[PDB]
Structure 1
Amino acid sequence: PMRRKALPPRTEKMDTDQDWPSVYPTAAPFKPSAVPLPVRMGYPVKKGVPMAKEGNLELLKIPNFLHLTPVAIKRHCAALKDFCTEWPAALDSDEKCEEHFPVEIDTADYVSSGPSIRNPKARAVTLRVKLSSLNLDNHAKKKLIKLVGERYCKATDVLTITTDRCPLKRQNYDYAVYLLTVLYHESWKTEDWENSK
């Protein structure tokens, strides 16, 4: 019962005009038997060369991009084009967007490594609208600016409503829209006590 003998590395059978994307379709660790390159890594000893690929822990510790090569990325994006949709041509500038879509909703996603996909910061939502875009009478704009306090910035004329109190992002998003509606309608309303300013 002799010990088993390892086969010769399959890099020997790889042609120089092969389809490398097929060799590394997805993210994998560095395999010295599949990567047909004489790469060396390691601080060399005096009168020594850097270590070879076979049995090289340092090359294994690297997050290689062999699966992501310029030929693969172009072949991948060619397939992914059918998913994309075209931005409306008319909105060629940021000022043009402010005209037709004055409300800016900021939402943040977080990607980390672990068993849990939960992040506490993902619930927060931020609404930013310019008071110029809102139809506000001279009375209304003064009332809107006093109620919002520091949320309004005179330099930029932007009202910032940040809502994180509710557990979910869809709840916090709907709450910020609610806060704007009440502030807008309340600003137009005139109360008798306002005549005493």
Structure 2
Amino acid sequence: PRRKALPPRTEKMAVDQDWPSVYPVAAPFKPSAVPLPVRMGYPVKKGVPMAKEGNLELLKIPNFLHLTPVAIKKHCEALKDFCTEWPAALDSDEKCEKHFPIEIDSTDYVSSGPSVRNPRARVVVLRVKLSSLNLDDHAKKKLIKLVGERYCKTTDVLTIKTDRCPLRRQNYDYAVYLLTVLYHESWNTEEWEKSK
């Protein structure tokens, strides 16, 4: 005799079970494992949406059965031990600017495929306010001319974008190097400057 398929194990599931144990991680829809009479499909005339068994439309969906509200809350209770506490002193953005005047922007790109590489990820953007820097009248004027369009008068923020090095850590160190040589050259006074 041919092999007879067993009945689906949904018939053994209790209505008060721990569902996260059934779908612990992302997995494709399994009719024999999902105890729901869910149907999908545009119905024919005087018909009904197709049943879940052999339903390709339900297989095409990126389901969230592994991310039920019950699961998310249990998952986050286990992930609290990995987190750190934000300093209470930094209550407002204005207080953050006072103590941490430099902002470093970087971007990570999550795509699907065999290669995790993305050339856009190397870019670094450094933003600082000239008010935060110890610049006298002469130095602030010279710094604005040197940076040109990188400085915005409305916001008083100097934006240095570095993307010429292969790596992000190199583009970060180069942005700091630029801020350092720009700061020290702004304080230096050459003899040709007298001809302003």
TM-score, with structure 2 as normaliser:
1.00
| % identical equivalent positions | 89
Q: What corresponds to 1:98 in structure 2?
A: 97
What is the one-letter code of the residue matched to 1:129?
V
Q: What corresponds to 2:121 in structure 1?
A: 122
* Structure 1 consecutive aligned stretches of length 4 or more whose deviation exceeds 4 Å: none
Does the alignment pair 1:14 with 2:16?
no
Count of aligned pairs between the two proteins: 196
- Residue 194 of structure 1 aligns to a residue whose secondary structure is helix
Cα separation, 2, equivalents of 1:61 and 1:3 = 31
What is the one-letter code of the residue matched to 2:125?
T
Cα separation, 2, equivalents of 1:47 and 1:100 = 69
What is the one-letter code of the residue matched to 2:109?
Y
Q: What corresponds to 1:112 in structure 2?
A: 111
Cα separation, 1, equivalents of 2:122 and 2:93 = 27
Q: What corresponds to 2:190 in structure 1?
A: 191
- Residue 132 of structure 1 aligns to a residue whose secondary structure is helix
- Unpaired runs of 5+ residues, structure 1, are none
Q: What corresponds to 1:177 in structure 2?
A: 176
C-alpha offsets along residues 73-95 of structure 1, whole Å, 9 cap, x if unaligned? 00000000000000000000000
- Residue 66 of structure 2 aligns to a residue whose secondary structure is coil
- Unpaired runs of 5+ residues, structure 2, are none
Residue 3 of structure 1 deviates from its aligned partner by 1.2
What is the one-letter code of the residue matched to 1:56?
N
